[PDB]
Design a protein around this ligand. Structure first.
Ligand SMILES: *[C@@H]1O[C@H](CO[C@@H]2O[C@@H](C)[C@@H](O)[C@@H](O)[C@@H]2O)[C@@H](O[C@@H]2O[C@H](CO)[C@@H](O[C@@H]3O[C@H](CO[C@H]4O[C@H](CO)[C@@H](O)[C@H](O)[C@@H]4O)[C@@H](O)[C@H](O)[C@@H]3O)[C@H](O)[C@H]2NC(C)=O)[C@H](O)[C@H]1NC(C)=O
Ligand SMILES: *[C@@H]1O[C@H](CO[C@@H]2O[C@@H](C)[C@@H](O)[C@@H](O)[C@@H]2O)[C@@H](O[C@@H]2O[C@H](CO)[C@@H](O[C@@H]3O[C@H](CO)[C@@H](O)[C@H](O)[C@@H]3O)[C@H](O)[C@H]2NC(C)=O)[C@H](O)[C@H]1NC(C)=O
Length: 236
């Protein structure tokens, strides 16, 4: 996250961190949405990653930190016509539930639709400088705006027209998500509305907002999987 500051230690209790085992290296983030389910981005997740809940400073282990791994890995396979840009979610079931604690609590799926002009919180351990690829040991937080999708469409020729992505950022530049913020939540007006996907590098350029996976498209699908539906998960 560029143009922000270190997050408050208690304002990201839903933020999950993915690590490889050896070496022990931060990969990306995810969102705890349920005591035993995490929602992440398909493009940065790979099998066997360690999942940490209740992490702030990567060099510190809080007394309530919990480590898990995925026992189930659900990709969105409902519409073969959707491009890779339109289905970048992975729903992970944890090997064991995590109870609430000082630094751990799930974030609910959005209960109202996203609205242009909202102020959106972004957070992550990703690159925090637009001039140097500096990765912090603590997560950084910042505010951006949910923008008209028109503000993004012209900058991503490779991405076809879609309704399944959100355009968010700061048009004057200076504030943006960057590499390895992938998978983190975009929280607009208190609602989990987006997942960090991709933008432009260098990051935080003027009039170069990023695209975010639109969470609300997946509510029914996620809830069905959590409810135990195997087949029947997708819509008819
Ligand atoms: C562990 O903590 C989470 C609470 O999540 C926190 O909520 C508060 C306490 C803040 O501290 C936030 O920072 C955290 O996000 C608990 O789960 C939440 O329970 C609360 C109950 O108060 C739910 O919030 C309410 O939801 C009402 C409707 O509930 C139903 O709909 C939602 C879906 O939107 C669904 O999640 C829930 O299961 C029911 O289906 C709503 O009318 C009300 O206005 C308010 O929004 C919230 O939905 C729960 N969140 C999640 C992610 O499940 C656990 O209760 C808690 N464990 C315990 C036992 O302490
Ligand atoms: C994320 O956390 C790390 C971990 O360091 C912590 O250090 C203490 C404050 C305790 O909280 C420990 O539990 C924990 O390991 C932070 O890195 C550390 O920063 C401190 C304070 O700046 C550094 O102290 C330096 O020590 C050297 C000698 O090596 C002197 O020359 C320095 O002038 C100064 O005393 C410490 O070196 C550094 N430690 C390690 C292991 O890296 C880090 O600051 C923190 N991140 C943020 C953003 O807060």
């Amino acid at each position: 996250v560029i143009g922000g500051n270190e997050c408050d230690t208690n304002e990201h209790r839903f933020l999950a961190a993915f690590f490889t085992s050896r070496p022990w290296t931060f990969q990306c983030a995810g969102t705890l949405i349920h005591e035993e389910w995490v929602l992440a981005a398909a493009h940065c997740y790979k099998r066997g990653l360690n999942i940490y809940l209740g992490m702030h400073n990567q060099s510190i282990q809080f007394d309530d930190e919990q480590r898990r791994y995925a026992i189930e890995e659900h990709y969105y396979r409902c519409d073969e016509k959707l491009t890779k840009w339109e289905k970048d979610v992975v729903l992970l079931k944890l090997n064991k539930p995590v109870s609430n604690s000082t630094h751990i609590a799930p974030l609910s799926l959005p209960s109202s639709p996203p609205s242009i002009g909202s102020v959106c919180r972004v957070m992550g351990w990703g690159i925090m400088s637009s001039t140097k690829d500096i990765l912090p040991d603590v997560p950084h937080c910042a505010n951006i705006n949910l923008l008209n999708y028109m503000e993004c469409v012209a900058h991503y020729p490779d991405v076809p027209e879609t309704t399944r992505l959100l355009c968010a950022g700061v048009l004057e530049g200076g504030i943006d998500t960057c590499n390895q913020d992938s998978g983190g939540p975009l929280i607009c007006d208190g609602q989990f509305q987006g997942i960090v996907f991709f933008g432009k590098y260098p990051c935080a350029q003027p009039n170069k907002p990023g695209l975010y996976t639109r969470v609300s498209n997946y509510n029914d699908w996620i809830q069905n999987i959590i409810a135990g539906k195997t087949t029947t998960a997708c819509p008819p």
